Design a protein around this ligand. Sequence first.
Ligand SMILES: [Mg+2]
Ligand SMILES: [Mg+2]
Ligand SMILES: [Mg+2]
Ligand SMILES: [Mg+2]
Ligand SMILES: [Mg+2]
Ligand SMILES: [Mg+2]
Ligand SMILES: [Mg+2]
Ligand SMILES: [Mg+2]
Ligand SMILES: [Mg+2]
Lengths: 55, 54, 151, 288, 95, 52
Amino acid sequence: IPRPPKHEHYPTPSGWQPPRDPAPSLPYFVRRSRMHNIPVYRDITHGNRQMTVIR
Amino acid sequence: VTRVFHQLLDMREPVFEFVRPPPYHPKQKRFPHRQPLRYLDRYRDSHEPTYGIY
Amino acid sequence: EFQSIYSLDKLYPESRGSDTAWRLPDDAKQANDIPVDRLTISYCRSSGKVNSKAEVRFHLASADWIAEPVRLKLAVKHKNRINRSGELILTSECSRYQFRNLADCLQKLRDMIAEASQPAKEPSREDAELRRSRIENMNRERLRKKRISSA
Amino acid sequence: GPRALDLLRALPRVSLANLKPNPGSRKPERRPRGRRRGRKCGRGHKGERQRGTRPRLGFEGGQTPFYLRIPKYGFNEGHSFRHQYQPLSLNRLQYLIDLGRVDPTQPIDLTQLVNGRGVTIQPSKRDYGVQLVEEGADTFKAKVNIEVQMASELAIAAIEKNGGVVTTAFYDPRSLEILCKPVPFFLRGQPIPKRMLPPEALVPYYTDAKNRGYLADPARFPEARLELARKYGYVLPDITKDELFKMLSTRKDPRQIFFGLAPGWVVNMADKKILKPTDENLLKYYSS
Amino acid sequence: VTYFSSRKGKRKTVKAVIYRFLRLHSGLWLRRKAGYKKKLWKKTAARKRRLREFVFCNKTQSKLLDKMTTSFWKRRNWYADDPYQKYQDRTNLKV
Amino acid sequence: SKTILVKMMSQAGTGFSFNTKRSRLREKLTLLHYDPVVKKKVLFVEQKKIRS
RNA sequence: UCGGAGUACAAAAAACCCUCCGAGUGAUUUUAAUCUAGACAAACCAGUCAAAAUAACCAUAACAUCACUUAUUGAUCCAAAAU
Ligand SMILES: [Mg+2]
Ligand SMILES: [Mg+2]
Ligand SMILES: [Mg+2]
Ligand SMILES: [Mg+2]
Ligand SMILES: [Mg+2]
Ligand SMILES: [Mg+2]
Ligand SMILES: [Mg+2]
Ligand SMILES: [Mg+2]
Ligand SMILES: [Mg+2]
């Protein structure tokens, strides 16, 4: 999968914003997805149980 | 009257409507039973296709 | 450099060169109704029912692309939707896509200039919602009929 | 990074001897032994069911079954022969261009979409190709040369405004299959087949400049195209004066599957060579 | 229903379903009313309308039909010109 | 006595049919009915005899 | 098989080789449309009402009526019809 092209303006038309140049100082880190998106998803179970996963 | 607000009161002219309450629909059910097809349109948000990931 | 019996040139011999389809016939339509650069076009994006209000604004007396008889006849029928600063305001709502809203506005404007530029417009009125109007009119006219000068 | 690693110095070797499946991974099965799960073993008592003989699925016990009292009606009628166009919103197209999956620089047809995995075609399901839908119309800023099998007025309008070109092309099922997965076809060892024409029902679609049909008379293109501007109220750019114009004008023959190859050639991928027929009959057949 | 076929060992579909029902992708099934072509002269226009409807099946019937029908019929379909494409997603359902 | 089910046809030139129970020993039936295509009250004359 | 009364005293439901009456249609012209909120009833299938909006007609004109009116009825498939 190709590294995303550098642009002159962020965020892009589709709203994609690359990660920062340094990393924050927080005592945790969230890797990007292999497709370069933020790994937050939603999940259902039993048809009524709604959840949000941070991966 | 239009002349009043502009000329005398130095105002824009307010205009009103008559607004009726939105019609009452029962809770939507997962399996609407013995209900016409057009049922699914009563709970429709707006008429436009939406292709989610597509 | 491939070519077939069914190719585009042998199907339509008349037009051939690859730049034929991309020519711009500005002479074909010289009318250019509604020179969009001369309109103020506003977008109110309402997201929640998801709909985007599109708003077309321009000054009616300062608009030269419409004739004088039509520019005056427009300010009559549509005086309701005119503004105290002289602006004629059109608005569309329906689609979530503002292309479709802009198009609705422009089609409305086209229609107004259409019917105003037609001298044959008879402005026919229905009796259904106007019966109350004619009868209450006549019946306030029975009372208005008292004649003595005043002031 | 992983502080877990530091706890592993302190603990014994990981070996085959100590290994635990994640708790909950295996729900243990239960066997009809003992006081609980024995003695009729969940099968109930006598009747048809304890013996395992209860009737087939739809059967209602002799009253005319629900699925058979309802009358037949064409619903799925002829379903196998309906055409199926996989939707692609401008939102996804934009999102693919932004992230550098498909590049707008070279022309974009089906193979390009498939290779970026922006879209998936399965001809066996009677997919006839991609259709273009308008979901991202307002947001769409890219400048592209795109070829799809169907498109909507609004979608086209949204591509023109940005100075690109849309064209609707047709592929028959075989053609389509070859188009989407080309490399599996080149290992097949067959010539490149002719592109079939559209069937009679689809001719009025691809002959119109309205749809920017690939079989359409180009004389109507700049006319109809400009029409689309009047409706959506934007200035139509001159595509002629652009630097990328030589790419934007690029077509296919209506009889050609790919860009730059021709019906009847053969791709030998081990030698990285192309092979073309010198014969007259073959060249008449493939070029007709 | 055949759960394991003889040649393929797969699970067969009951075609008698596929002629009278329609599966939206949400899982709702759609059917004609019964007796809607039968003895029309004898019926009220109101009743006739109630009969001309397309109606939805309750959960039980739905599960029954799903069992009687293989995977292929539950796939996401995009048809050109399709009347019913409007209805295949579900909206605003709070459960 | 028996009655009969007759097929009645529009004289509006629109093919439209509706069936009516009519007395067997009576005369050929003619009515003023509603035709949906023309959206009018028109004359229907009995074309055919359906059920007896 | 369908309906009315009692059983089943006042919301509903409620059995019997229980007690009693009925239905398997006439007669008539006012020939009784389209579409749709919300409901009743209900294992399923079937049954019931019904506002607003259209179109028909006085030019702001939609319940066929009577016989205790309640019942006068029959699913799929399949056949005949051609709309
Ligand atoms: Mg999941
Ligand atoms: Mg076991
Ligand atoms: Mg036990
Ligand atoms: Mg024991
Ligand atoms: Mg035993
Ligand atoms: Mg038993
Ligand atoms: Mg697919
Ligand atoms: Mg109830
Ligand atoms: Mg009404």
